[PDB]
Design a protein around this ligand. Structure first.
Ligand code: HEM
Ligand code: HEM
Ligand SMILES: Cc1cc(N)nc(C[C@H]2CNC[C@H]2OCCNCC(F)(F)[C@H]2CCCCN2)c1
Ligand SMILES: Cc1cc(N)nc(C[C@H]2CNC[C@H]2OCCNCC(F)(F)[C@H]2CCCCN2)c1
Ligand SMILES: C[C@H](O)[C@H](O)[C@H]1CNc2nc(N)[nH]c(=O)c2N1
Ligand SMILES: C[C@H](O)[C@H](O)[C@H]1CNc2nc(N)[nH]c(=O)c2N1
Ligand SMILES: [Zn+2]
Lengths: 403, 403
């Protein structure tokens, strides 16, 4: 019934009781664990998700059962009855947004869950206006390098009609251009998205860090191409504290990590375009983005500059180079005065967050494989921490690509 | 598509469906409501388990349905009916032991499953004879440095009769002495067992690396204490290819990783004392044993020698040091010409193992968090491989400490 969660470093032990407020099923069954997969494959249902969410809200501001709580429940019943749907009040939205981040099992930065700038964008009618909002969000979130976490929430989905979508997977993304030789200049992860921009009229550059434009989609209309004003997009050239040759690799990364393809579910309403951003954890860039074989895959290159022995694996040239790369990122950011958090600091404050959430809620859904960073795993306290994963609502979801 | 778990590799973009999981006759800890994937520990019934394994045996020799097959079946239910247990034929045992290693979701060494040496010790009747048996195992398996995989199978559980048990978790372990100061000299993992040996008559050593004696338990007797002749316990003094001072730390490790407290379950029958052994992956010693906060914890020590800034996380001092320590392990094992495998090579052969298993059985149960190494996760290909975990049989199980 209630599972026992141990830390193998300290011998400490908790019991997750939060996991009973899970109303949504995951992929595992008693017969096989599938917890390592990246993805899945009526008035009544909405009304109870809403009732539950409203109760969560009035609880969150300790007014459960009071006057405004009663009339608000009746307001919702009344609106669903007559229309098959309802709408959120600004504050209610702001609550749900904070809560869906709080509930995200794969986010290691949740210590921050309470500090979130919310832009109400539900009064959007054109892709033009989407672009305007997307630009104010960026200017806000970037703040000359002192990064502030943000979300912008575009109009909810509606059964009569198509969705507001941002086709881009991230507001800021580097193009991936497919060469004659069947190789890739730029980011391999963004090949298909770079192809769409082009087909919808974009003139492409041909460097390895060409910021893609945005494809914005208003209901039931063709998507529209908007170029991001280059001064909004704060980038960081990568140099290395001791290695003078590093900078000449002309490596660089963008400051703002802002996901833009996930759906935000609150009280069983759905928000198909609701981009969110915080700040990077170094490993995201130094390890995944630059060292993944199916990304920029710079490991061999760097290591050769370091003059390490590539011939065998036991000289540990991959690990050696991986470290200098993450190192380079941290220095470069810290030097350009842009918010960055290394994997040690981040995981330490996630242990803290686990402890906060323990006393506050009786648990914390967490996805161990995603919370443990991609280098130096066991070197970080989270490695040694048993974790329970489950789905609480409000939530972010994956949704299908609009095309 | 197919109605079995679909299994993606994200570096390569390749897909497989796991049909092997259908063969799983036993629940693990996950449910649709919550994933417990990351948790470390979780007469009538006999006959059908036995029937199952006999069916497996006959499959493996291509004889499903035949006179010998069905006679063996008749033979087994005769024995159970008459006495409540039954006994394995020699080759049946060899098959099952190899099948339990093949079936183990948390071992990355499984590409070698077919090449294991099975020592039958079901005739053993004393703790002296147990000791002898263990000595031969260590001898054979150590093979002067050219390591050979082995298991020594002692007699099974009996209805109302005491188990054959090895009290030590591993055949070779270093002492852990609790200090009046609060600290621990030696390996803190081994505090209890060290204390259980002194209590049973061992005269303790003084060191960070004192090899423990064996507590061996014949059925229904107190455990007897046996000291391994030093010449049998092959150890590797640690040193660094280039950092000359490392050899001065006086760190060392033993060659033979030999688990000894696991239960081996074949077709219903339970072998409570059936120690097995292989060769190390570099990271077991260099990253867990030596760098864990709750073990030798030598990360700080080493970083000071390398002269890193240990006053801030973002110097990645832990990362740097851990890489040199892992490197020190490989160089030192290579130098002493003792078998070892680094995390890269190992993870590569596990991908090949996965490919093989797909073709042979249609899947491979795999505990992702456990397969992926404790440094350089995403640098090894297993990190990009989705894994299904489920329990097949023959199996190795954890089992309660005998005391
Ligand atoms: C504020 C600083 C933040 C840090 C340091 C951080 C860190 C991370 C990291 C390391 C991941 C793993 C992602 C990957 O490797 O692709 C992640 C995922 C995630 N984070 Fe954050 N995060 C931050 C802010 C936020 C904010 C503001 C939100 C929402 C408003 C958020 C919600 C999420 C979600 C929903 C995921 C899941 C990605 C997925 O399922 O694919 N995080 N975060
Ligand atoms: C041949 C060389 C082998 C290598 C390189 C290897 C590698 C590993 C590694 C790295 C682990 C994880 C250990 C940890 O960090 O706690 C492991 C676990 C395991 N291995 Fe192996 N293995 C080898 C041979 C064997 C053999 C001969 C057996 C038995 C026949 C075996 C059975 C197991 C089992 C049952 C586990 C799970 C331990 C647990 O559940 O705590 N392996 N293996
Ligand atoms: C808000 C926030 C802060 C932060 N530091 N980091 C993040 C994750 C970002 C950064 N670094 C990767 C990206 O994460 C994007 C979410 N995951 C992407 C994916 F891998 F799942 C694929 C497959 C299916 C869905 C689409 N893309 C978010
Ligand atoms: C046969 C073989 C080959 C190899 N390379 N490596 C091994 C694992 C050994 C060595 N290095 C770790 C140890 O694995 C032993 C089992 N690990 C789990 C544990 F240590 F946490 C505890 C708690 C649960 C109960 C059991 N023991 C075996
Ligand atoms: C298949 C596996 O689950 C996948 O490669 C995961 C592993 N852990 C991860 N962890 C984080 N933080 N981000 C990721 O994208 C992944 N990818
Ligand atoms: C807490 C977490 O489940 C635990 O620390 C696991 C993670 N992966 C592991 N993987 C291996 N090979 N060995 C281990 O001991 C662990 N420990
Ligand atoms: Zn699971």
């Amino acid at each position: 019934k209630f599972p026992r969660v141990k830390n193998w470093e300290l011998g400490s032990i908790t019991y997750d009781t939060l996991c009973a407020q899970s109303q949504q099923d995951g992929p595992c069954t008693p017969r096989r664990c599938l917890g390592s997969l990246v993805l899945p494959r009526p008035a009544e249902q909405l009304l109870s998700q809403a009732r539950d969410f409203i109760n969560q809200y009035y609880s969150s501001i300790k007014r459960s059962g009071s006057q405004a709580h009663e009339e608000r429940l009746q307001e919702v019943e009344a609106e669903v009855a007559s229309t098959g749907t309802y709408h959120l009040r600004e504050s209610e939205l702001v609550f749900g947004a904070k809560q869906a981040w709080r509930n995200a099992p794969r986010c290691v930065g949740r210590i921050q869950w309470g500090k979130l700038q919310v832009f109400d964008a539900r009064d959007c009618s054109s892709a033009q206006e989407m672009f305007t909002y997307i630009c104010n969000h960026i200017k806000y979130a970037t703040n000359r390098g002192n990064l502030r976490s943000a979300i912008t929430v575009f109009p909810q989905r509606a059964p009569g009609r198509g969705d507001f979508r941002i086709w881009n997977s991230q507001l800021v993304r580097y193009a991936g251009y497919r060469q004659q030789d069947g190789s890739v200049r730029g980011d391999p992860a963004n090949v298909e998205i770079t192809e769409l921009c082009i087909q919808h009229g974009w003139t492409p550059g041909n460097g390895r860090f060409d910021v893609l434009p945005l494809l914005l989609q208003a209901p039931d209309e063709a998507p529209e191409l908007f170029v991001l004003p280059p001064e909004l997009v704060l980038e960081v050239p990568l140099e290395h504290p001791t290695l003078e040759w590093f900078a000449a690799l002309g490596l660089r990364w963008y400051a703002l990590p802002a996901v833009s393809n996930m759906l935000l579910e609150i009280g069983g309403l759905e928000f198909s375009a609701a981009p969110f951003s915080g700040w990077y954890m170094s490993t995201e860039i130094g390890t995944r983005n630059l060292c993944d074989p199916h990304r920029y895959n710079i490991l061999e290159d760097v290591a050769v500059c370091m003059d390490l022995d590539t011939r065998t694996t036991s000289s540990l040239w991959k690990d050696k180079a991986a470290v200098e790369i993450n190192l380079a990122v941290l220095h470069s950011f810290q030097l350009a005065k842009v918010t960055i958090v290394d994997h040690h600091a981040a995981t330490v404050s996630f242990m803290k967050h686990l402890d906060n959430e323990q006393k506050a809620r009786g648990g914390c859904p967490a996805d161990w494989a995603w919370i443990v960073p991609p280098i130096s795993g066991s070197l970080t306290p989270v490695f040694h921490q048993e974790m329970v994963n489950y789905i609480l609502s409000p939530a972010f979801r994956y949704q299908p690509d609009p095309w």
